């Protein structure tokens, strides 16, 4: 006499989508942000396109950890190139970069997904409502790149490889580890990438309309947001979108975002880790020496209630580690999610990072090996309530 | 039975009482990431802040300090936050700051000096030809601040205290140690701050004209002519460089001017109490978010040291200079140890010098020990010594 959650997946992608490729931040200074993030997250300096490379238009530095690719880009003076261009990223434009950065501060310009063919992905998107940002451009007859608007001044970037490198894109030089111990805190890939918009409805119509991504449902049972999740056919590309819920006691954090960010844009990046305990131990140590800071931890009560909730999946010693590191735990139909959120990455209370680990949903593919289903454990919607619960209990125990 | 003498003039012709270098303000796109990077790279503690979390709706400003050295990183918030000020720095302007950063990239906006009275300093300066930037403003009846143009978009900022704080300026909250045992690599104060301009003559005329700073002589191509302006006591030192055109190798000064979009501050020399300690600390962090250093001199350079400075430095101290790539020069009065970083941000503009001065220890009216300003000069000899050592190293391949 149990309960059951049932999921639909129409597999309606209008073109073949593979995986998240990279995230591009537009910065004022690529070098300082890239250096800070490298130390904070344990990402390796892996490729570059700048003056030391021939590029007189923009400085672009790629950091990597597993399959996660973070690109930091900033403009040089236009005066350098006031005389075929030395830029490696065809979309890049001085005007656009400066305007974006003045308007929004440090933030994500481009969410990039690898696809079978960027030309067709772009053609199909425009046909089905997508606003063009940058057209399909082939690079050294090796890579095609196109951009459509996602929300705000964020673009969805399509990347397609002509056939079966660590140089990322044409025009980039590989950087070799200048170290006997290169950095690695266990971050492996991008899990989801969440936008904030003024109204969820139109936003969803737009994106899903041109992509054919479907709604991934969350097991449910005050937070100031209303959200839905767009998902690719295999549910490995996940694009949540939030809107503000007006009226509530505490002002919507989404509404604050929209004010400080001067509009819609990317709110957070959930980075998947092979082991959140390792990652957080590393990141927390670096919090006060140039790394990232974390949101205030749950009360003790939260951790007393974990065995009740996840004592089947997590051992006692793992629950103590969760408490020591301020880790939230949620569970859905299919599996269990460990998560934590940083404080903002730059000056404004806009963009932040989530570290997650997914437990469960191991299944066999056609090769005979295992994979983990995308969205295993959900996105931690349970935790808002589980956190308000634990605070009120903590009070009543005081 | 035959020696040489270098004779220094000092007209002590300052037009107002100057005390010391007070702080340096960098204008950024993102103050947090630059401040975090610098803190880790240079070993400077987070001391104070003025931002949203303190009530500041106009600008985010973060103070790092190491001994008497004070670095301030400032960036603009959206105008819309403060359309209805909470600003701690009265001179700050959204448009000016955006415009600076768009034009010059990461750079020093303000060279700040403590004077006895900022109001009179501004008055006497403007009367003697200075172009005013911000008029004298008194803050919480406690501190007075005024600004005049130094060169390009760099301002000389005057700071005077009413009479007889660790909160730097009114409106700034002190930051306590998040972790006991703050970051400290041995940097103790600013030694000098150097500007690049297109023409030395007009620039010196202007500055000396309104300060009454005298010329400080350098005891005895490199693509530059240099002149040093100095306060009465020679503890405030302000070198200025111009390019020497037609030289074989293009002038590094001329490069600066092209990449920076004009005149601006080229380098900051930071005094260390133990340059060996400082550089071991800084070097271990180079590849993990810190700063990179210029290419070391050839082994020849270190072999020539005992002849040049064997009386001041021991054999083991010379091997240490060789381990760390440290340059050594001498003048009339004493000995200098120096090393230069690679650019601090994207552009080949501003960099940092780390110095230790050895010698000219003297006593004052109180009888307290002081070291004279400029002990050992500024390393002008090292241009030749570098060229020599490279010629010698190349000749001995044989
Ligand atoms: C759709 C979708 N995709 N991911 C989600 N949910 C989250 O990321 C999420 C879960 C839980 C929490 C918390 F429990 F900590 F309140 N979140 C928060 C907390 S927060 O203070 O606002 C943020 C500004 C740190 N933000 N996102 C989430 O929804
Ligand atoms: C006055 C005054 N204030 N500072 C100075 N001079 C220097 O700092 C200086 C001395 C020596 C050398 C070197 F030996 F390495 F060539 N410098 C350099 C070398 S560099 O590759 O151009 C720079 C771009 C690192 N830059 N400034 C100096 O003079
Ligand atoms: Co999330
Ligand atoms: Co110098």
UniProtKB/Swiss-Prot annotation, chain A:
Disulfide bonds: none annotated. Signal peptide: none annotated. GO terms for cellular component: cytoplasm. Pfam families: Glyoxalase (PF00903). Its cofactor is Fe cation. It is an enzyme of class 1 (oxidoreductase). CDD domains: HPPD_C_like (cd07250), HPPD_N_like (cd08342). Keywords: Cytoplasm, Dioxygenase, Iron, Metal-binding, Oxidoreductase, Phenylalanine catabolism, Repeat, Tyrosine catabolism. Binds 1 Fe cation per subunit. The keyword Protein biosynthesis does not apply. It catalyses: 3-(4-hydroxyphenyl)pyruvate + O2 = homogentisate + CO2. GO terms for molecular function: 4-hydroxyphenylpyruvate dioxygenase activity; identical protein binding; iron ion binding. Fe cation binds at residues 192, 268, 354. SUPFAM superfamilies: Glyoxalase/Bleomycin resistance protein/Dihydroxybiphenyl dioxygenase (SSF54593). It is found in: Cytoplasm. Pathway: Amino-acid degradation; L-phenylalanine degradation; acetoacetate and fumarate from L-phenylalanine: step 3/6; Cofactor biosynthesis; prenylquinone biosynthesis. Homodimer. Catalyzes the conversion of 4-hydroxyphenylpyruvic acid to homogentisic acid, one of the steps in tyrosine catabolism. Belongs to the 4HPPD family. This is 4-hydroxyphenylpyruvate dioxygenase. The gene is HPD.
